[PDB]
Design a protein around this motif. Structure first.
Motif, PDB file in Angstrom:
ATOM      1  N   UNK A  34      61.730 119.712 -22.879  1.00 51.70           N
ATOM      2  CA  UNK A  34      60.292 119.494 -22.992  1.00 51.70           C
ATOM      3  C   UNK A  34      59.974 118.010 -23.137  1.00 51.70           C
ATOM      4  N   UNK A  35      60.768 117.289 -23.932  1.00 55.98           N
ATOM      5  CA  UNK A  35      60.528 115.863 -24.127  1.00 55.98           C
ATOM      6  C   UNK A  35      60.744 115.077 -22.840  1.00 55.98           C
ATOM      7  N   UNK A  36      61.824 115.365 -22.109  1.00 53.61           N
ATOM      8  CA  UNK A  36      62.075 114.620 -20.880  1.00 53.61           C
ATOM      9  C   UNK A  36      61.048 114.987 -19.821  1.00 53.61           C
ATOM     10  N   UNK A  37      60.502 116.203 -19.876  1.00 52.12           N
ATOM     11  CA  UNK A  37      59.387 116.544 -19.001  1.00 52.12           C
ATOM     12  C   UNK A  37      58.139 115.750 -19.368  1.00 52.12           C
ATOM     13  N   UNK A  38      57.882 115.585 -20.667  1.00 57.05           N
ATOM     14  CA  UNK A  38      56.689 114.867 -21.106  1.00 57.05           C
ATOM     15  C   UNK A  38      56.779 113.376 -20.809  1.00 57.05           C
ATOM     16  N   UNK A  39      57.980 112.800 -20.875  1.00 55.28           N
ATOM     17  CA  UNK A  39      58.153 111.373 -20.632  1.00 55.28           C
ATOM     18  C   UNK A  39      57.911 110.983 -19.180  1.00 55.28           C
ATOM     19  N   UNK A  40      57.805 111.951 -18.277  1.00 49.20           N
ATOM     20  CA  UNK A  40      57.632 111.665 -16.863  1.00 49.20           C
ATOM     21  C   UNK A  40      56.227 111.146 -16.573  1.00 49.20           C
ATOM     22  N   UNK A  41      56.103 110.451 -15.446  1.00 48.52           N
ATOM     23  CA  UNK A  41      54.818 110.022 -14.909  1.00 48.52           C
ATOM     24  C   UNK A  41      54.777 110.392 -13.434  1.00 48.52           C
ATOM     25  N   UNK A  42      53.686 111.027 -13.011  1.00 50.52           N
ATOM     26  CA  UNK A  42      53.535 111.422 -11.617  1.00 50.52           C
ATOM     27  C   UNK A  42      52.786 110.337 -10.857  1.00 50.52           C
ATOM     28  N   UNK A  43      53.410 109.671  -9.891  1.00 49.60           N
ATOM     29  CA  UNK A  43      52.729 108.600  -9.164  1.00 49.60           C
ATOM     30  C   UNK A  43      51.692 109.154  -8.195  1.00 49.60           C
ATOM     31  N   UNK A  44      50.849 108.245  -7.700  1.00 52.05           N
ATOM     32  CA  UNK A  44      49.794 108.636  -6.771  1.00 52.05           C
ATOM     33  C   UNK A  44      50.360 109.158  -5.458  1.00 52.05           C
ATOM     34  N   UNK A  45      51.542 108.692  -5.062  1.00 51.85           N
ATOM     35  CA  UNK A  45      52.194 109.123  -3.827  1.00 51.85           C
ATOM     36  C   UNK A  45      53.244 110.190  -4.092  1.00 51.85           C
ATOM     37  N   UNK A  46      52.978 111.078  -5.051  1.00 45.23           N
ATOM     38  CA  UNK A  46      53.940 112.119  -5.391  1.00 45.23           C
ATOM     39  C   UNK A  46      54.252 113.015  -4.201  1.00 45.23           C
ATOM     40  N   UNK A  47      53.258 113.287  -3.352  1.00 42.40           N
ATOM     41  CA  UNK A  47      53.467 114.197  -2.233  1.00 42.40           C
ATOM     42  C   UNK A  47      54.508 113.686  -1.250  1.00 42.40           C
ATOM     43  N   UNK A  48      54.763 112.379  -1.223  1.00 38.19           N
ATOM     44  CA  UNK A  48      55.768 111.813  -0.335  1.00 38.19           C
ATOM     45  C   UNK A  48      57.017 111.331  -1.051  1.00 38.19           C
ATOM     46  N   UNK A  49      56.899 110.904  -2.306  1.00 31.76           N
ATOM     47  CA  UNK A  49      58.052 110.420  -3.053  1.00 31.76           C
ATOM     48  C   UNK A  49      58.764 111.548  -3.790  1.00 31.76           C
ATOM     49  N   UNK A  50      58.024 112.321  -4.591  1.00 31.55           N
ATOM     50  CA  UNK A  50      58.631 113.445  -5.296  1.00 31.55           C
ATOM     51  C   UNK A  50      59.152 114.488  -4.316  1.00 31.55           C
ATOM     52  N   UNK A  51      58.389 114.771  -3.267  1.00 31.40           N
ATOM     53  CA  UNK A  51      58.886 115.604  -2.188  1.00 31.40           C
ATOM     54  C   UNK A  51      59.749 114.770  -1.245  1.00 31.40           C
ATOM     55  N   UNK A  52      60.377 115.447  -0.288  1.00 35.56           N
ATOM     56  CA  UNK A  52      61.216 114.786   0.699  1.00 35.56           C
ATOM     57  C   UNK A  52      60.441 114.384   1.947  1.00 35.56           C
ATOM     58  N   UNK A  53      59.130 114.603   1.962  1.00 31.09           N
ATOM     59  CA  UNK A  53      58.305 114.279   3.117  1.00 31.09           C
ATOM     60  C   UNK A  53      58.180 112.764   3.277  1.00 31.09           C
ATOM     61  N   UNK A  54      58.297 112.255   4.500  1.00 30.13           N
ATOM     62  CA  UNK A  54      58.055 110.829   4.729  1.00 30.13           C
ATOM     63  C   UNK A  54      56.583 110.485   4.565  1.00 30.13           C
ATOM     64  N   UNK A  55      56.326 109.213   4.247  1.00 37.52           N
ATOM     65  CA  UNK A  55      54.950 108.742   4.124  1.00 37.52           C
ATOM     66  C   UNK A  55      54.178 108.920   5.423  1.00 37.52           C
TER      67      UNK A  55
END
Length: 80
Positions: A34-55
């Motif tokens: 839970x703590x390591x989940x909370x420490x995360x930050x979701x960037x504005x380009x999550x749809x391309x960085x967090x996923x494997x999709x190219x920009x």
């Protein structure tokens, strides 16, 4: 990419999920997860960085929906 992991797992570039602790207590590991989940930050380009999709694919999708709505509003302007 998700399940196959050993001693370290990087599902997204900003998050690292370690293997279960040696002491092996479910309460402490639950708290750690839970703590390591909370420490995360979701960037504005999550749809391309967090996923494997190219920009480029994300930009193409945005352009396609923009041209669709532009065509629709152009037609509606003709409808008056």
């Amino acid at each position: 990419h998700v399940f196959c992991g050993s001693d370290n797992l990087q599902i997204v570039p900003g998050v690292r999920i370690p293997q279960p602790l040696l002491q092996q207590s479910e309460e402490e590991e639950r708290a750690r997860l839970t703590a390591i989940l909370s420490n995360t930050i979701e960037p504005a380009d999550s749809l391309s960085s967090w996923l494997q999709l190219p920009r480029e694919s994300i930009l193409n999708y945005e352009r396609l929906q923009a041209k669709e709505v532009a065509s629709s509003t152009e037609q509606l302007l003709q409808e008056m």
